[PDB]
Write an enzyme that holds these catalytic residues in place. Structure first.
Site: not given
Ligand SMILES: Nc1ncnc2c1ncn2[C@@H]1O[C@H](COP(=O)(O)OP(=O)(O)O)[C@@H](O)[C@H]1O
Ligand SMILES: Nc1ncnc2c1ncn2[C@@H]1O[C@H](COP(=O)(O)OP(=O)(O)O)[C@@H](O)[C@H]1O
Ligand SMILES: [Mg+2]
Ligand SMILES: [Mg+2]
Lengths: 535, 126, 528, 52
Positions: C94-95, C61, C391
């Site tokens: 948050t990232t 996170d 989350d």
């Molecule tokens: N199955 C997937 N395929 C492609 N991109 C994904 C998938 N699942 C999540 N993402 C991407 O991951 C990003 C978010 O990453 P994550 O670390 O889960 O949350 P955070 O936004 O807090 O970093 C989002 O911008 C999303 O587009």
């Protein structure tokens, strides 16, 4: 490779971002993975010499100088003073395996170390660690399904305890109590079966009291279908043995009552003083007579009592013991079938517990006396009393017996077993091997690495037995492939046969599945870590 | 804590501080309680001046100890390990092991040891 | 400079102003963003941070990682603050917020080095952010049907998307179904305190369960507890806030008697007070007794003699969840224990979970609360599982509030970048360069995804740009096939509020950082 | 290899055998070259300088 970022700005001005950043270290990328992998490999290689019947014990010394000689992997990792975070993760994995199952705390560490060792050479060829973790998960699912397929059920009924005794013997084989192996297995099985909810429900280990006293011999360890108390009769002149005892359990001290609220009793005249003295004497006589009225042959208290009550108890032919602890009070009440009475006025005949024999036990030239309560009607609590030539083997016997109790508890929860000696590992590795060939190329490397890591247990068993690891493992795997028999393992004891069906090497399926699952999850978690920020 | 060289008093009827030390005032102000670096507790009768009985049960020295809520003839939690004694029998009736200082909970069913044990369950509660 | 016999400010004051100060601020923001770069996407990685006490924390996170870092740079702390803001308001992204803010600052750094006035950059950011938020609200896909099956499927897909970056991504479907089930049973406020999270060491991830009721650990049972039966088939639960012990009637109470008869009467009166409380509890018909305050050994044995169950010192939130599930009321007095204030569950049972005893209240039909029992092989394993589930829970709650979704994988941001570039190509030209820089900066997230996956970011970005320009709105990065795909058809769904808040917070942080021109650091007082 | 339980002398002799076989294979893949062939010399020099 360390110290993080340090630029002090492209203009010469101070560039401070993190508090005390010049005394902090950082690892980035593949170097962190390699460091973690080698740390886990070191921990696993330390553990792997204590695997199997021929495994050797470890001598743990704490910061106070106390010495612990043990083979239990969870205990070894708990008492090991580690500082590396991955070593702490290995210790936590062992503790988790001990908590959930109670047996196989060493197999998880070896399996995780082998998995990370294979993942290292997989990473060196340019595979993302997440892909390795996904392949490990797929192979673990395949192995768990195969374990379910090759599992065999056993009878848990009390009329035939042979499979349970065999499983307990298999668990105890690696421990130092293999000299008294069958007796220890028998007492563990009897203890678990005695205190358990028969409808496949839980086993409450608080009902099993494990006590160890030095002296005697390890063969003198016995299972008592009652309670062992570390107390004796209060008055030295009371009889040391009561038969057909009607037991009264009391949580009220044999002292004049006192209110809990702040109280002051005012003596305003000589008549008041005489009344107070008479009240004290009559209260003592009344409590003793109330105890005697119910027909009790023996009274057990929790909060002790003073001299007048002691002499009245001796005078009325009422043996008594004082200052019995709360858990011991509960165990005595459970075993003897009597209720716990909070005050004398509530003591009746129906609340009396019954014990066939209450005796005082001496222990040689030691001045120590301990009470034994046994021969109950339907005792639902047991005590395992362990003897030995030194306290260290007593502690080791305690933890080995705990392992046996946990294994029989697991059999109670689920009655499906898988034959050990590496047979389960070899069969699972084979199944992962066939399931890898059908899979596309990219996950094949991860699946075959998982299979090779699974193969470490038979190789470790062969090496601990002095046998050649690779040759014996290959021969056993070929024999398993040739004839459809997943019960072929490593002949650690050199009995002359590789079939664990005849050697009666039996392990619970739950333990194997939990080992595989926990190892896979910990390996994935470690593989996903790519930065360290120690201060 | 040492009393003044002569207590600097004249006929106060309480200048008999005694404290020969040949500590803690017990609630029934007739006895004095001394523990030394040898790890053994001592009971003295302040009136007669005689060593009532000793409490050799601590391998380590008893740095601190605490008394019963009242006279109570018992309790005597002593922190070397926490050990509870009974003057009616002179035995460690209750022992604990999991010491900066030991303080007895005024309710009577517990005691706190120094960066809490329950006497009705032989187990730590807090 | 000159000695200035009497100096203006206190000795040791450090001041930095001008273009170098702002450039250094941008560099510090870049340094902060670099610390969470590899945690984004399904191919993201975890970070391990050790504090001074030696306790290590392992987290994917971004907000947690930024909080653990002891950032002291005044400009860098803005990124941590906006990460905290994104976590508080939304719970996910948050990232992305930090990456977007740092990318904005990096893109405008060359213009800053040329002497461009910061107010122009701030106005350009404000215009671009307003346009981007309006575009997000315009193109977000919503369904105006209120179909229960469709709504549940949408919630599950959003939870899976929020979960497919954590260590539990292998069991993301299982955990997403659990999370949706848990959220759908909250009544109207979706209070987080109504979802209990219990972590028990040992067992696999798939062994974790969601209790349609309430469960909590056994709380220091007294003597005589083991005689109490540990299973009931239609119990009535008496939730109490009462100390069932023999104790002083009041702290300042004092008893003055001058007769032994009165002494005995007082002792019997204390005993009768306790027994009257216990008898009033018993006559209520309740079989399970839970108290917020301690329950003594006398009460425990009394209840054991009546085949009852007692559990004192229950935590307050666990009692609140038990009240919300079984449907009773916490009573500070036992004088009126009517059937109205008694809870009711189908099955109560005490079982063992990984060496710990837990009390289960299952079968509640009108339950408005839940309890997650998470199994894992390590403490940090369970903690990070809890963070991932949190989350997912925030995402599902926000989706409940408004069922507006956009495709993930960078598709929404590529569409926004194309729209902003098209808009910027039709303005005088001083703002054109800055809005184009903003649009180029929005491409960080797909590039970071490709970099984390070990892809070729340039080729994927070129394909995405061409596809968006020639037609296609929800085309993003396909991690599995190392190509681009219609992420909307791949069910990579994010609530629109996540990206709206991310853009708003990142723009505000960038504008705040750019607006500063001088930093003054007063000397520390009481350094000791 | 050592972890599998192989003495570090069988490994050495097996490595010697593998080295001899590899020398045979490399000689098999080789192609005769004449110093008059300037193009091959230029190609070898360029290949040497490719990594610098
Ligand atoms: N199955 C997937 N395929 C492609 N991109 C994904 C998938 N699942 C999540 N993402 C991407 O991951 C990003 C978010 O990453 P994550 O670390 O889960 O949350 P955070 O936004 O807090 O970093 C989002 O911008 C999303 O587009
Ligand atoms: N009699 C036996 N013959 C062959 N192998 C055995 C025998 N007893 C135990 N083993 C093997 O030894 C391994 C280690 O068991 P043990 O040391 O008892 O506990 P742990 O699994 O915690 O190390 C098990 O995987 C089991 O297969
Ligand atoms: Mg074992
Ligand atoms: Mg997310």
């Amino acid at each position: 490779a360390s110290m993080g970022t340090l630029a002090f700005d492209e203009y010469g001005r101070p560039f401070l971002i993190i508090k005390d950043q010049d005394r902090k270290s950082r690892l980035m990328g593949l170097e962190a993975l390699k460091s973690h992998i080698m740390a886990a490999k070191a921990v696993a290689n330390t553990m792997r010499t204590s695997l199997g019947p021929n495994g050797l014990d470890k001598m743990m010394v704490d910061k106070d100088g106390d010495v612990t000689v043990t083979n239990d992997g969870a205990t070894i990792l708990s008492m090991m003073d580690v500082d590396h975070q991955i070593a702490k993760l290995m210790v936590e994995l062992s503790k988790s395996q001990d908590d959930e199952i109670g047996d196989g705390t060493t197999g998880v560490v070896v399996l995780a170390g082998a998995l990370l060792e294979e993942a290292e050479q997989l990473l060196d060829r340019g595979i993302h660690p997440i892909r390795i973790a996904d392949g490990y998960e797929q192979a673990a699912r395949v192995a768990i399904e195969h374990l379910d397929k090759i599992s065999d059920s056993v009878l848990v009924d009390i009329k035939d305890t042979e499979p349970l005794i065999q499983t307990a013997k298999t668990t105890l084989g690696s421990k130092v109590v293999n000299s008294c192996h069958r007796q220890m297995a028998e007492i563990a099985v009897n203890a678990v079966l005695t205190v358990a909810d028969m409808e496949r429900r839980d086993v409450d280990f608080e009902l099993i009291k494990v006590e160890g006293k030095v002296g005697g011999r390890l063969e003198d360890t016995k299972l008592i279908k009652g309670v062992i108390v570390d107390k004796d009769f209060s008055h030295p002149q009371m009889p040391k043995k009561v038969e057909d005892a009607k037991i009264a359990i009391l949580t009220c001290p044999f002292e004049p009552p006192k209110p809990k609220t702040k109280h002051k009793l005012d003596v305003t005249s000589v008549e008041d003083y005489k009344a107070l003295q008479k009240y004290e004497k009559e209260k003592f006589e009344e409590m003793i007579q109330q105890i005697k009225e119910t027909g009790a042959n023996l009274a057990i208290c929790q909060w002790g009592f003073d001299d007048e009550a002691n002499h009245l108890l001796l005078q009325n032919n009422l043996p008594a013991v004082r200052w019995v602890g709360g858990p011991e009070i509960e165990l005595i009440a459970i075993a003897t079938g009597g209720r716990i009475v909070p005050r004398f006025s509530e003591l009746t005949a129906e609340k009396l517990g019954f014990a066939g024999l209450v005796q005082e036990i001496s222990f040689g030239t030691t001045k120590d006396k301990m009470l034994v309560i046994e021969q109950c009607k339907n005792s639902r609590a047991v005590t395992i009393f362990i003897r030995g030539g030194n306290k260290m083997i007593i502690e080791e016997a305690k933890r080995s017996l705990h392992d046996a109790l946990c294994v029989i508890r697991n059999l109670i929860r689920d009655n499906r077993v898988v034959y050990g000696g590496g047979a389960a590992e070899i069969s699972c590795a084979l199944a992962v091997s066939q399931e890898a060939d059908k899979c596309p190329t990219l996950e094949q490397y991860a699946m075959r690495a998982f299979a090779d890591a699974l193969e470490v247990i038979p190789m470790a068993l062969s090496e601990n037995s002095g046998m050649n690891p690779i040759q014996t493992m290959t021969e056993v795997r070929a024999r398993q492939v040739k004839e459809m028999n997943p019960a072929l393992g490593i002949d650690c004891l050199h009995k002359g046969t590789n079939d664990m069906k005849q050697q009666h090497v039996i392990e619970t399926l739950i333990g194997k599945k939990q080992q595989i699952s926990l190892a896979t999850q910990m390996v994935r978690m470690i593989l996903k870590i790519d930065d360290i920020r120690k201060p | 804590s040492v009393y003044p060289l002569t207590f600097d008093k004249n006929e106060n009827m309480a200048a008999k501080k005694k404290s020969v030390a040949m500590c803690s005032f017990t609630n029934s102000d007739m006895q004095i309680l001394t523990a030394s670096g040898d790890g053994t507790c001592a009971l003295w009768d302040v009136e007669s001046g005689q060593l009532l009985q000793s409490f050799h049960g601590h391998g380590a020295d008893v740095l601190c100890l605490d008394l019963a809520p009242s006279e109570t003839g018992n309790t005597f939690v002593s922190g070397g390990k926490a050990m509870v004694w009974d003057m009616r029998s002179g035995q460690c009736v209750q022992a604990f092991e999991t010491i900066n200082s030991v303080r007895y909970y005024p309710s009577g069913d517990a005691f706190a040891s120094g960066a809490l044990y329950d006497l009705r369950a032989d187990r730590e509660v807090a | 400079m000159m000695p200035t016999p009497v100096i203006l400010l206190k000795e040791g004051t450090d001041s930095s102003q001008g273009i170098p100060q702002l450039v250094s601020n941008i560099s510090a923001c870049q340094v902060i963003a670099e610390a969470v770069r590899t945690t984004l996407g399904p191919r993201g990685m975890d970070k391990l941070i050790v504090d001074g006490r030696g306790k290590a924390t392992i987290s994917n996170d971004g907000a947690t990682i930024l909080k653990l870092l002891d950032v002291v740079h005044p400009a860098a702390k803005t990124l941590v603050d906006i990460a905290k803001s994104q976590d508080a308001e939304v719970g996910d992204g948050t990232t992305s917020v930090t990456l977007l803010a740092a990318e904005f600052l990096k893109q405008v750094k060359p213009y800053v080095e040329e002497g461009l006035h910061p107010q122009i950059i701030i106005r350009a950011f404000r215009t671009a952010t307003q346009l981007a938020v309006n575009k997000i609200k315009e193109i977000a896909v919503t369904v105006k049907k209120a179909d229960k099956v469709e709504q549940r499927k949408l919630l599950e897909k959003c939870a899976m998307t929020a979960l497919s970056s954590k260590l539990i991504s292998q069991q993301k479907a299982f955990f997403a179904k659990m999370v949706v089930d848990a959220v759908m049973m909250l009544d109207d406020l979706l209070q987080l305190k109504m979802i209990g999270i219990k972590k028990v060491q040992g067992g696999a991830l798939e062994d974790s369960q969601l209790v349609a009721g309430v469960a909590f650990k056994k709380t220091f049972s007294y003597a005589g507890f083991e005689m109490q039966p540990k299973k009931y088939h239609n119990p009535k639960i008496a939730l109490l806030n009462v100390e069932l012990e023999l104790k002083a009637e009041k702290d300042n109470a004092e008893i003055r008697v001058h007769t032994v008869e009165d002494y005995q009467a007082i002792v019997d009166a204390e005993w009768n007070i306790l027994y009257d409380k216990l008898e009033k509890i018993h006559h209520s018909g309740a079989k399970v007794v839970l108290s917020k305050l301690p329950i003594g050994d006398v009460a425990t044995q009394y209840f054991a003699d009546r085949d009852m169950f007692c559990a004192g010192r229950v935590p307050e939130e666990d009692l609140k969840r038990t009240m919300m599930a079984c449907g009773g009321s916490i009573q500070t007095s036992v004088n009126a224990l009517s059937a109205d204030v008694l809870g009711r569950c189908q099955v109560f049972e005490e079982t063992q979970i990984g060496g710990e005893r837990y009390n289960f209240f299952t079968g509640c039909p009108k339950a408005k609360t839940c309890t997650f029992i998470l199994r894992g092989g390590a403490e940090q394993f369970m903690e990070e599982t809890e963070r991932s589930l949190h989350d997912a829970i925030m995402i599902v709650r926000r989706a409940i509030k408004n069922d507006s979704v956009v495709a993930g994988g960078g598709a929404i941001e590529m569409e926004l970048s194309k729209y902003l570039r098209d808009y910027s190509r039709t303005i005088p030209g001083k703002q054109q360069l800055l809005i184009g820089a903003y649009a180029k900066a929005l491409e960080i997230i797909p590039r970071q995804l490709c970099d984390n996956a070990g892809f070729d970011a340039t080729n994927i970005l070129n394909k995405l740009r061409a596809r968006h320009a020639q037609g296609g709105t929800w085309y993003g990065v396909d991690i599995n096939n190392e190509d681009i795909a219609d992420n909307f058809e791949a069910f990579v769904w994010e609530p629109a509020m996540v990206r709206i808040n991310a853009l708003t917070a990142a723009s505000e942080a960038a504008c705040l950082i750019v607006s500063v021109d001088e930093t003054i650091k007063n000397p520390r007082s009481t350094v000791d | 290899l050592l972890q599998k339980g192989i003495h570090p002398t069988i490994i050495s002799e097996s490595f010697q055998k593998a080295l001899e076989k590899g020398i045979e294979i490399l000689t098999d893949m080789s192609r005769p070259v004449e110093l008059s062939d300037r193009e091959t010399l230029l190609n070898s020099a360029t290949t040497s300088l490719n990594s610098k």
